[PDB]
Symmetry: C2
Subunit: 150 residues, 2 copies
Amino acid sequence: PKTIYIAGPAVFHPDNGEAYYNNVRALMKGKDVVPLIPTDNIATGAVNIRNKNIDMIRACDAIIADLSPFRSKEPDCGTAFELGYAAALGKVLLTFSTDTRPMVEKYGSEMADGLSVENFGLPFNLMLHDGTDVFDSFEAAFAYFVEHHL
Amino acid sequence: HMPAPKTIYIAGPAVFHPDNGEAYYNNVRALMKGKDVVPLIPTDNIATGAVNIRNKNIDMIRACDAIIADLSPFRSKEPDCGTAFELGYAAALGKVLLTFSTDTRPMVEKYGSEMADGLSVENFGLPFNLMLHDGTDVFDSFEAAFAYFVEHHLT
């Protein structure tokens, strides 16, 4: 029974990600996979939340990271960190975003607020992209997983 | 003579500076002059192609003894996600993790509440997302993070 770490800023929504995770649970029910939900409200304190989340990344088979814009046109840094942790461990890396326009399109130019905008046809920072397509939703990323990863 | 200096990956959004970070990186080099430690500078203007840049940066992270990551606000009150990824990569490999920000106020002070624009703000007394904090002090500047490295990790 495989495990997927469910990374992303759903946890900051007013419902603490309840609807997002319920949707994730419903999709993976009965498919020999089980979600690993971040511990941001099952552990107490920043230290044990970080450690238990890291434990889940070490245990997972793949990570599905929601790189949708968070508070700006940039994805959530906590999700980015978890993706880097998973990448260093050789996990299967799957990402999606609700806005997959190239960064230069999102920002309107190759510079905003005095800072240059990456121009590689990618929707976000190039470190977050390992060659696999950026999917449109958790469903698309999860459907890709089941077909190519048992 | 320097057979085996320590190495530090210089992570952060300086690559997006209008000079591609040259003034920042030149100062990093000057700070390390004459010490048994050398900088590994992101390849963001070394290699062409997003694939090769990412591969080259990961090469440097795998090689490094420590990462000093600039987690200052980047285009918002949040740090740069590229730097955050590199910190996660280094953390998984067990590197020495050092971070700094030009704004070390807790997130709830930065955002002025525990919820901002319908999205909650972490309330753990940390200046940024708790994944990016491993227990070490958050320093004020590269200078401060590097001085901590010199005191504790150099010799």
